[PDB]
Amino acid sequence: PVIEINDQEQFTYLTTTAAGDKLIVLYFHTSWPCKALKQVFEAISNEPSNSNVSFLSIDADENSEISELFEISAVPYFIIIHKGTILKELSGADPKEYVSLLEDCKNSVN
Numbered sequence: 001p002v003i004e005i006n007d008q009e010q011f012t013y014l015t016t017t018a019a020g021d022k023l024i025v026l027y028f029h030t031s032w033p034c035k036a037l038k039q040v041f042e043a044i045s046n047e048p049s050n051s052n053v054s055f056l057s058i059d060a061d062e063n064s065e066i067s068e069l070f071e072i073s074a075v076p077y078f079i080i081i082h083k084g085t086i087l088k089e090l091s092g093a094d095p096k097e098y099v100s101l102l103e104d105c106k107n108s109v110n
Contacts, residue, residue, distance in 0.1 A: 002045045002055045011066055024054045026079040028072050037076050040095050082109055
């Protein structure tokens with residue numbers, strides 16, 4: 001599953017206080033093409049073998065401060081975070097590239 005991010009305190013809680021040592025995957029998007037890709041992101045998030053990864057979707061227009069923090073200039077955009085730092089950023093567009101990277105990262109951090 002995905003958690004929809006709607007405010008800064010929630011975002012901070014889920015990426016820090018409540019994050020443990022999980023891989024955290026951020027998906028920046030807009031609700032106005034980008035809709036279809038969010039559905040794929042959600043489906044990937046719903047895989048049982050991803051049950052130990054935290055997936056956070058972030059509407060870039062509704063979450064200005066978070067977009068600024070990550071210097072988002074285009075969507076869709078992926079940021080993978082682990083143990084308090086950014087592990088990888090990826091110019092969001094291609095599900096195959098995304099799954100490939102996610103599986104490598106999951107393996108690297110295990």
